[PDB]
Symmetry: C3
Subunit: 133 residues, 3 copies
C-alpha cells in the first residue's frame, strides 16, 4: 500500500478538462491532453521519489459480436453514443450506426492481403485502406 516502485500505465481518467480549466489552461492544450494516456515510472528509495510521465495518445477499443446490436460510444472523433450493428455481407463487414447522425455507418471488406474500410456519415463518405504489418 506504501510501495509505489513500478511502471504504471493509465487505464481511466475522470473530470480532467475541468481540472485543466480550473488551472487557467486553454482549449487546444485541453483538447490535446484529453486524447493522451500517461505512464508513470516511479523509482522510490525510502522517502525519495523519482517520477516520469510519458504520454502516447488514448488508444481506442471496440468490442462487438456480428448480429448483436451494441452501444458504440464514438469517442476520439465525436463524443456521441451510437447503437452499432455488425453483419456479414459476403466477406464485407457492414455496420449501421444508429444515433444522432443520419446515414451513419461504415463498410469494410478484405481484398487479397489488404483491408478496405469505407466510412459513411450523412453526405460525407470516407474511404480507408490499411496495409498489413
Amino acid at each position: 500500500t506504501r510501495d509505489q516502485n513500478g511502471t504504471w500505465e493509465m487505464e481511466s481518467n475522470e473530470n480532467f478538462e475541468g481540472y485543466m480549466k480550473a488551472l487557467d489552461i486553454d482549449f487546444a492544450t485541453r483538447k490535446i491532453a484529453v486524447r493522451l494516456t500517461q505512464t508513470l515510472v516511479i523509482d522510490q528509495d525510502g522517502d525519495n521519489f523519482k517520477k516520469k510521465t510519458t504520454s502516447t495518445f488514448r488508444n481506442y477499443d471496440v468490442d462487438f459480436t456480428v448480429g448483436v446490436e451494441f452501444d458504440e460510444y464514438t469517442k476520439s472523433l465525436d463524443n456521441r453514443h451510437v447503437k452499432a450493428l455488425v453483419t456479414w455481407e459476403g466477406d464485407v463487414l457492414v455496420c449501421v450506426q444508429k444515433g444522432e447522425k443520419e446515414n451513419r455507418g461504415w463498410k469494410k471488406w478484405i481484398e487479397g492481403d489488404k483491408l478496405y474500410l469505407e466510412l459513411t456519415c450523412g453526405d460525407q463518405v470516407c474511404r480507408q485502406v490499411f496495409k498489413k504489418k
Copy 2:
C-alpha cells in the same frame, strides 16, 4: 566535420513559438507543437541526405523527498511555480501546492495492482487510475 549521420534526440529548443509566429501559424497549432519532442534520423550517402523526423510527447520528470518542501515548476500543466510539500497521511501520499491557486494538491495511494491519483484544485477534482505493468 561534415558527418551528421546519426539518430539525434532533441535536448533543447528555444524561441520556437516565435519562429512559428513569424511563419504565419496560429494559436492552437502552436499550442500542439510546444508539447512535442522530435527525433532526427540522418542517413548520409555521399552528398545525399535522408532525414526522418519522429514526433512524440515530452516526458516530464519530478524528484522530491517527503517532508522536504521543494519548488515545483509545473511544466506539464500550466507553467507555474509552486512550493510543494509532500507528507505521509497513513499510507496515502498527500501533497499541498502553495501558490496562486487555493486548495491545490494531490493524493496518491496504492491499492493492490492499481495506483489511484486524485488531483485537487479549488472545487475541481481530477481522478486518475493507473495499472501496474
Copy 3:
C-alpha cells in the same frame, strides 16, 4: 473466408477533413487529427471481435542532395512551397528556402556529440540542440 485477425498499418485513406467537419468537431481537434496515422489490432474469435486502435504521429521524411535545388512543400509547419537549396559553408550545413517568406532558412552543424540546428524566418531565430543516441 473471414479471419482478418491481424495488425494493420494505415497507408492511404481518403476524404477525412470533410468527414471530421461533418461529425461536429473542428478548430483545435481538426488541426491535430489530419497529422496522425493509426494502427489497428483486430482479435477475432469466431463471431466475437475485440479491436484496439492505437495512434501515433505521421512523421515527416525529407530527401535531398547538397547543391541540388529542390521543391520543398513545408508541411508539419505552415504548408508552403519553397525552393530549397542546401549548401556547405565550411562545416555548417546551410539551406535557403526561397518562397513567400524572406530570410527563411536553417543552418546545421556538428559540435562534439551534439547536433545544433538554427531555424531562421525573418527576425525570429529558433535554436535547437540534439544529442546523439
